[PDB]
Design a protein around this ligand. Sequence first.
Ligand code: CLR
Ligand code: OLA
Ligand code: OLA
Lengths: 4, 4, 397, 361
Amino acid sequence: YXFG
Amino acid sequence: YXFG
Amino acid sequence: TMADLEDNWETLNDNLKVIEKADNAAQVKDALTKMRAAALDAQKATPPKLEDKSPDSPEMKDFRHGFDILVGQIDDALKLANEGKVKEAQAAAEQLKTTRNAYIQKYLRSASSLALAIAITALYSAVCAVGLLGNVLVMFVIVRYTKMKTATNIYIFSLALAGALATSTLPFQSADYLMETWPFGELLCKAVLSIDYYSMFTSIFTLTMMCVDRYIAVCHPVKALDFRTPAKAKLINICIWVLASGVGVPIMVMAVTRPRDGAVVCMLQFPSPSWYWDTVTKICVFLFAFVVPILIITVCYGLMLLRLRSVRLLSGSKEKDRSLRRITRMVLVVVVAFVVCWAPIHIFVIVWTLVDIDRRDPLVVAALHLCIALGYINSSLNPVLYAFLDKNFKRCF
Amino acid sequence: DLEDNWETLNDNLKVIEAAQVKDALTKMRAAALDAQKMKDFRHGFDILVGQIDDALKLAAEQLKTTRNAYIQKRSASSLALAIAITALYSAVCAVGLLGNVLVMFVIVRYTKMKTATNIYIFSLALAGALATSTLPFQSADYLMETWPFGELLCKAVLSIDYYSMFTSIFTLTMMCVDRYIAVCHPVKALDFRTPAKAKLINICIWVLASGVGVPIMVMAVTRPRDGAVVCMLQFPSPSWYWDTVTKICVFLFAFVVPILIITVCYGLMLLRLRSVRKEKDRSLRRITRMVLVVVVAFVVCWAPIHIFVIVWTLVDIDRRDPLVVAALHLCIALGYINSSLNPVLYAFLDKNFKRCFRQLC
Ligand SMILES: CC(C)CCC[C@@H](C)[C@H]1CC[C@H]2[C@@H]3CC=C4C[C@@H](O)CC[C@]4(C)[C@H]3CC[C@]12C
Ligand SMILES: CCCCCCCC/C=C\CCCCCCCC(=O)O
Ligand SMILES: CCCCCCCC/C=C\CCCCCCCC(=O)O
């Protein structure tokens, strides 16, 4: 989880 | 190189 | 900013090659026009080397003088391009290379980000290969050998299915980072983003329930013979996977590819005001997928230590009571691992939203991709570590 | 249960740290008796029972040192290690395959192999992609403790592993020779460093190395040892002899000889530079610097596995010991780092994708  |  | 300094420095260099490979005066003219505007823009900036130096310091005056000589020479090459000369104007571009080398170069030294990109690719590929193939193997051993006739085997399958779905995103995410663009299209962008948010919730909520299930087994062993039934475990997991579609589907609807600076971006298109709903999503993800799971699991631990402190206080037989103390120590292991893996990225998303972060700095890039990766390490390592330490599963593998 | 007995031995060592320590020591012995209930593991509990007997008479932490003769034959510590190795082989394999395929693509599609240097890079990239392709099999074998792909695939893995080791190392040695020729003999370099001659040298390497690849393919067999299957070379009688000859020939021709040649190449390129008397003058100084990076990385990446192969043949090594196993596969992968993620392959990408990775400090 973090994209983008 | 080294297997096994 | 230094982004402006880097981009202007890049524009100067890129337009030198334009003249180098030019054939007409129209090509030479506009390249020098861009180069002139980028030289005047760059002389206004302060080099990272001289960031600690006064705008009127001798080094800072020397950096600016280099651009004065460059602009003067660009204007000499411009009059040749305007006059109709393409041989002399191209020859004057060569003396422009000696100027930015003997005057400016010393202040605008550069390094390669190749070793970082390799390390990042290595990190995503290792976390993907262990994660995906590992959980595909876990799922195979449960389906084909350790047949899911127990409550635990149903929970290991849910964590395994989620862990595998999570890590299947990583090849696309790392190709995007390398290429500095989304080359897979909108449909693959929707599949990626939806699977990313979806598998996050299925993974975390199936893990949370495992700790609740362990709590019931340890603290209510007689009542657990009714609750910890495989048909009851089957139902809980289906509810998680069906419930989690309130996250997967909206992300699939909002996931879009948009053009930005000649490159393609895979992103979420939030309703008006997009900045608001984007911030709300980041808050709800932090609360439901991080805070709520920590609370439930910590409460499961605290209750377990209390229920075993009473058996210890009873002083009857710690000969088999210690066999449950190993299960609660494992709950502390699961909660610390979840915090250490998820806390850095969740803090990163909060700082990213409130503060301006240097997207270009290799320290922030290294830290960002390490942070993203730890979340995957947790989602794919919880099922494999549980399964390969399960007595029944170990015999069946 | 052996796992339950293992825990009761440990969970009781902490109860000690007069009557309580004695009642704990006797509880430890009954578990240790049922833990003994393959002959080497049983010997461990005989030393453990005997030490407990001396402690019952009275040793305090001496039982923890004797426990290191039964632990390898901790629980999660073994799993953490197997994961770490799987992660190391998969990182080396995935960066190796993709880095080498990409280099080859850049040369085939964009560069178009006109220079001699690009032929030496294509061959080095092809050798690296073949080298890294055996890793899924080598890492699966480690995990399963058996060869589950049969003899034909054992022959393919062992032959490709030996063949690609020599094609890689000799293409790298010849690259340094080719570059040495440019720096020191430029009048002679004009006639030697032509793409047709680079093509011939590289082809000769690939055909020559078949004198290793073919006998290794012939000897590669799958044989059963302790209920499990092993992928191995079956040398003619006396096997111990031909095994020692093979190990000495690989260490000499694929390690010392390439270092010696690249080192002699470095030092001569160095004298040529010292003999001088602006930009074209220091352009050759970058090439000589690159040769030094090549030789340092070669010695760094290849020396540990060679010192390990020698130590293994000479000294009885505990194959089970956790830190021994960790050090072995690190040494193996570290050899593959040179083979497939070579400093020449790095420099080539750094040149061709300059703009993508260039950024101000
Ligand atoms: C759970 C514990 C052990 C981990 C601590 C989290 C660490 C690794 C993370 C969480 C938030 C992160 C920071 C978030 C924002 C910034 C600002 C940016 O301009 C530089 C990097 C920096 C300063 C990050 C560095 C690493 C960081 C501090
Ligand atoms: C186990 C899975 C392995 C993960 C590998 C990830 C795939 C890498 C994908 C693409 C690399 C393309 C290389 C191009 C880099 C140059 C930059 C550019 O083209 O803009
Ligand atoms: C986009 C991917 C979505 C996939 C949805 C998967 C939903 C199923 C989820 C978890 C299965 C949990 C195991 C319970 C089934 C028991 C096996 C059985 O007896 O039928």
